[PDB]
Ligand binder design. Sequence first.
Ligand code: HEM
Ligand SMILES: C=C[C@H](c1ccc(-c2ccc(O)c(Cl)c2)cc1)n1ccnc1
Length: 391
Amino acid sequence: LLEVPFSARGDRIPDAVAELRTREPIRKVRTITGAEAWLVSSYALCTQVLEDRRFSMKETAAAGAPRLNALTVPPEVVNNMGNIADAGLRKAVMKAITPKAPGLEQFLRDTANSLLDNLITEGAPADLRNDFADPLATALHCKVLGIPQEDGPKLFRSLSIAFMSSADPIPAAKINWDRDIEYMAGILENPNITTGLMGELSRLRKDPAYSHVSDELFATIGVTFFGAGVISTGSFLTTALISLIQRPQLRNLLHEKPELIPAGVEELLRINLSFADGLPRLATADIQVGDVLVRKGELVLVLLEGANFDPEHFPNPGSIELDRPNPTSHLAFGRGQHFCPGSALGRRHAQIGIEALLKKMPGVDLAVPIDQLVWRTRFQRRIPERLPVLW
Ligand code: HEM
Ligand SMILES: C=C[C@H](c1ccc(-c2ccc(O)c(Cl)c2)cc1)n1ccnc1
């Protein structure tokens, strides 16, 4: 039985995806746990699954369910956004993580420029993942959360385990989770934390309108939004920089006309291979998806690059075109009930990071042949362990 995932490489889509999409856009596969699942790979069927709440994220955590991979958080945290919504916290969380917070964008620009100046001083080769994209993501999320910048690196170092895609429970994930929760709980008790997401959660925790909300949920919001935001923005920016480096004509165009960078980033989102696995959902009813009657209790995997390279929806899907008529209609941020709450922040992180890099390093190029990149395995993102560049 066809095994998923197909390839940990984030620099090229396997030819097999287009064949599946054409012939079998919903197809039985085996996951790393040995479970069977339905892999959905067309824009039409991916959108159908993501927009039908009977394909449940929450129920993927149920004991005894077929699993894509092992939990790395407590099972109730899989329903984190539902818990946030039920607690009356959605609006406050969203307001806290907007890129338009006063001074946030300038902080992003200043941080990016400082990171780049240090790389220039040290001399090529430079590692754009470990010494640019990931520190930029980490610094951004410390600022957004309102926590000390110097605490970023230790929180960041949880994530190479936190976002593993493992067949089995990971003992280090429990250690790191418990430690990171204790940290966020202490932050909520720290009177000096008055800004950002944790400053606002700290205030709401003392507000009688929220007296019922548990300390557990407040700390969980901090751990989950830091982890999801840092891994997603650092990994997306890293692999978008590869796509851009691979396209010198586009790199030069965006350097010459940086007002096109938002359109460029939107296409880089569309062609991004950062998510290593399909998005998992558990059927809570018998539901017809294409030619397959998915049965209650079965696992469905929504393959984002299946949708995003679907030529019916995005003609010439492998080409970056800055004037498509349907440019934000990709699924890079998901779709439906679980659409990424951080989407605007993720866009802005990448836009500013790329703007800064192109100004400082207009000649940026890989310093090794592209096949020498080392792609992280058994992880929820596809990323190169190092991204060596020259300029
Ligand atoms: C370019 C950057 C990002 C990408 C590509 C991305 C991608 C995604 C995708 C595809 C989903 C849907 C998962 C699903 O439906 O199963 C998602 C959800 C989520 N994202 Fe993002 N994300 C990014 C940035 C962020 C940021 C900056 C934050 C927070 C600061 C964040 C926090 C979350 C959370 C908490 C969820 C879960 C939502 C829910 O369960 O309803 N993400 N993200
Ligand atoms: C399913 C939840 C997933 C998520 C997974 C793992 C973590 C995590 C963070 C720090 C840790 O120390 C450990 Cl061990 C785990 C956080 C979040 N997620 C993705 C978007 N929203 C939530």
